[PDB]
Amino acid sequence: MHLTPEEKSAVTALWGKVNVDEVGGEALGRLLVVYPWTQRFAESFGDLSTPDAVMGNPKVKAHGKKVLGAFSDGLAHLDNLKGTFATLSELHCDKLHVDPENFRLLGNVLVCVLAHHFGKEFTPPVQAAYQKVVAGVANALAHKYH
Amino acid sequence: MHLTPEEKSAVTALWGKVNVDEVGGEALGRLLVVYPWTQRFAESFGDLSTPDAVMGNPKVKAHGKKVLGAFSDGLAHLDNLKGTFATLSELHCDKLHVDPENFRLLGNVLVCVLAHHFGKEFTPPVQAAYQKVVAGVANALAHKYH
Amino acid sequence: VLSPADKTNVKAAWGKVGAHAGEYGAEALERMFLSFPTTKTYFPHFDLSHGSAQVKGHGKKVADALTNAVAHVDDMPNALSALSDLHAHKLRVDPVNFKLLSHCLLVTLAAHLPAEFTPAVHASLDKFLASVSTVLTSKYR
Amino acid sequence: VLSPADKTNVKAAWGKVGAHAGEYGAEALERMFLSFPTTKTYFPHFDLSHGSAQVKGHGKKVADALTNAVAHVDDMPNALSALSDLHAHKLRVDPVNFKLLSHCLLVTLAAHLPAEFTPAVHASLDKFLASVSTVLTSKYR
Ligand code: HEM
Ligand code: HEM
Ligand code: HEM
Numbered sequence: 187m188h189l190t191p192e193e194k195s196a197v198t199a200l201w202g203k204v205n206v207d208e209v210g211g212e213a214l215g216r217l218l219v220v221y222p223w224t225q226r227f228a229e230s231f232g233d234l235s236t237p238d239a240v241m242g243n244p245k246v247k248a249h250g251k252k253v254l255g256a257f258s259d260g261l262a263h264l265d266n267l268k269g270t271f272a273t274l275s276e277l278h279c280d281k282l283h284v285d286p287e288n289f290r291l292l293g294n295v296l297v298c299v300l301a302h303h304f305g306k307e308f309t310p311p312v313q314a315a316y317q318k319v320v321a322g323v324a325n326a327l328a329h330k331y332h
Numbered sequence: 333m334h335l336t337p338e339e340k341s342a343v344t345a346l347w348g349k350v351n352v353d354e355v356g357g358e359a360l361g362r363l364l365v366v367y368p369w370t371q372r373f374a375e376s377f378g379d380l381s382t383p384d385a386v387m388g389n390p391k392v393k394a395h396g397k398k399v400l401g402a403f404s405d406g407l408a409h410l411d412n413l414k415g416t417f418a419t420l421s422e423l424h425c426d427k428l429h430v431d432p433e434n435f436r437l438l439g440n441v442l443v444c445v446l447a448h449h450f451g452k453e454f455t456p457p458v459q460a461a462y463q464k465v466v467a468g469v470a471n472a473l474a475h476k477y478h
Numbered sequence: 479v480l481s482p483a484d485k486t487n488v489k490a491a492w493g494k495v496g497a498h499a500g501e502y503g504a505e506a507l508e509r510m511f512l513s514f515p516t517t518k519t520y521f522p523h524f525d526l527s528h529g530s531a532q533v534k535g536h537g538k539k540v541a542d543a544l545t546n547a548v549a550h551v552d553d554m555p556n557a558l559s560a561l562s563d564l565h566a567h568k569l570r571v572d573p574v575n576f577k578l579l580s581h582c583l584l585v586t587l588a589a590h591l592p593a594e595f596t597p598a599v600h601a602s603l604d605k606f607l608a609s610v611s612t613v614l615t616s617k618y619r
Numbered sequence: 620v621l622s623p624a625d626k627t628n629v630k631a632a633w634g635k636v637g638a639h640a641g642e643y644g645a646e647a648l649e650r651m652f653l654s655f656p657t658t659k660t661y662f663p664h665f666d667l668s669h670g671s672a673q674v675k676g677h678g679k680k681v682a683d684a685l686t687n688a689v690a691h692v693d694d695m696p697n698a699l700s701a702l703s704d705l706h707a708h709k710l711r712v713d714p715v716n717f718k719l720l721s722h723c724l725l726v727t728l729a730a731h732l733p734a735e736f737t738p739a740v741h742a743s744l745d746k747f748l749a750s751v752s753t754v755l756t757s758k759y760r
């Protein structure tokens with residue numbers, strides 16, 4: 187987590203404009219569609235057979251919102267991600283058995299989502315700040331694996 | 333490092349039995365042969381047209397010894413690889429233009445060479461501690477890239 | 479393997495790029511340089527400053543090649559043979575870097591084609607870039 | 620793409636494995652579990668303790684499939700269709716993991732076939748495990 191002050195202000199200024207409900211749904215939905223293998227964790231979500239079935243599934247939308255919810259909180263503790271995410275890291279490992287690579291795929295999808303939404307506003311340099319951020323969060327979420 | 337005293341001792345004790353001269357030459361040469369693209373940095377070494385020509389090339393063997401040398405000294409600062417490889421990290425970035433991914437390829441080659449050499453002695457638990465060190469070293473070396 | 483669906487998706491999304499491919503190619507590079515600085519080790523000879531003509535020049539070359547793979551979507555291995563040879567034998571770019579560029583290309587397109595950058599298209603474009611990367615890396619060893 | 624030399628190298632090396640492939644399968648898993656603990660996420664239902672019969676059994680299973688791959692080195696895609704299916708539609712292991720098992724497999728062969736694990740044979744087996752990895756993840760999407 188080598189976020190320069192200016193990188194941190196940039197992350198924070200943009201995060202100001204995000205509708206976490208919405209972004210959360212899009213990011214998770216898109217994950218399940220671009221990397222269908224990730225659907226292994228959601229057999230109880232119902233119908234994920236097509237893009238529309240995934241993007242529109244009430245269960246995917248609700249889960250996305252939850253996930254981005256936790257991510258937003260992470261954004262307020264950029265100084266202590268490991269701490270912030272420790273009980274969640276344990277849960278994903280010990281109970282959910284989620285391969286941490288999943289956390290990196292979601293980060294990339296999220297970055298594409300932000301690009302999608304902010305257009306020209308998601309400048310090369312803002313992307314680089316967000317790249318450091320999703321990597322920091324994925325690392326924090328994997329810190330307790332064993 | 334996130335090495336356990338037990339993990340530290342395993343590393344340390346196997347290393348004591350290592351001929352850096354021989355292991356250094358073999359690790360670097362295997363690298364040039366398994367991942368042919370790493371040869372882009374050693375054009376001046378000569379004929380690397382064949383396994384035999386690589387494994388026999390003295391420039392390769394001598395570069396290999398220089399590399400394991402520095403690696404070897406890094407095992408004495410296992411609790412600050414960052415500070416031990418700072419100058420070497422800048423050098424690699426700013427002068428050599430070596431993509432840090434190469435550091436990881438080498439690491440894995442190193443482990444294969446140790447297993448090759450020590451057979452029985454190179455147990456799952458010992459490999460595990462070594463994997464942590466090679467990853468650690470690669471990270472330290474890549475630390476100053478910008 | 480790309481499905482008919484995928485093919486339609488790619489031709490469509492790339493269709494929209496049109497005349498902006500060059501600029502989008504340049505932008506994908508800059509994004510890459512900024513987010514994954516290790517990729518810079520391959521362009522020690524370039525001016526990587528913002529608005530570098532070398533980068534502009536290079537973005538166009540990359541975009542032309544992608545445009546060429548789209549035009550030959552059913553015969554990419556052959557359409558890209560020469561480039562596959564160049565990369566394996568001269569440039570010797572470590573394979574992991576292809577995924578980094580792919581990624582920055584997807585961000586760029588996302589940033590410029592909001593109406594077309596749908597979930598389905600995104601998936602198609604991702605499989606496409608993966609396939610291009612595979613071709614370009616096929617003769618490495 | 621496996622060259623004829625490669626196919627020879629592989630068949631030779633695997634030839635020496637013989638009645639021990641099962642044990643080497645088991646040892647490779649154990650090394651993978653300890654070195655890359657994230658791989659354990661795919662085996663929650665197993666007893667991953669040293670010498671577990673679940674691990675041993677699975678070790679055999681994997682070993683056997685490799686054998687069958689060496690034997691049909693010329694027609695891998697076809698020899699492993701079913702396995703490619705299982706992995707893409709049921710197991711859904713993330714592709715990054717194949718590289719981890721492949722590596723633990725080299726380490727294991729190296730440690731057991733000193734004479735035979737020459738630099739040229741190392742290169743071949745690597746390519747081979749790589750090809751096997753590609754085949755197994757080819758129907759992922
Ligand atoms: C930014 C990364 C992520 C964050 C912050 C996050 C956060 C959360 C939270 C807050 C919960 C609910 C905790 C609870 O049930 O007590 C959860 C559950 C879950 N997460 Fe994660 N998650 C992340 C990534 C992922 C990814 C990428 C996957 C799978 C590809 C995943 C799989 C799951 C599953 C399967 C559940 C349980 C859902 C249920 O059945 O109730 N998570 N996550
Ligand atoms: C274990 C990781 C490595 C360590 C500890 C290491 C260390 C060293 C050292 C101590 C030098 C001496 C140069 C000087 O002081 O001027 C050197 C040079 C160099 N290294 Fe690294 N190195 C590592 C990995 C690599 C890899 C993987 C490559 C490329 C495949 C590489 C490419 C080079 C080159 C091209 C030189 C310059 C030699 C010359 O001047 O001809 N290094 N390295
Ligand atoms: C799908 C992705 C890629 C495509 C389509 C592509 C295509 C090309 C093309 C068309 C050229 C110019 C060849 C000529 O001179 O005619 C080129 C050159 C080059 N590429 Fe690639 N490339 C890709 C990936 C990469 C990556 C990921 C890197 C490294 C990060 C890279 C590094 C280079 C370098 C260093 C050159 C030489 C440029 C110069 O010296 O002018 N390429 N590439």
Ligand code: HEM
Nearest residue numbers: 658661662677680681684685710712716717720721751755
């Ligand atoms: C070298 C590539 C691989 C080969 C040849 C291979 C082969 C096999 C075979 C033969 C089976 C048993 C099928 C059956 O039960 O009928 C299997 C199952 C399985 N494989 Fe793969 N595998 C490979 C890579 C991986 C990797 C890297 C992982 C995860 C890290 C993995 C995870 C699994 C799991 C979880 C099962 C099912 C275990 C059970 O419930 O018994 N495989 N694989």
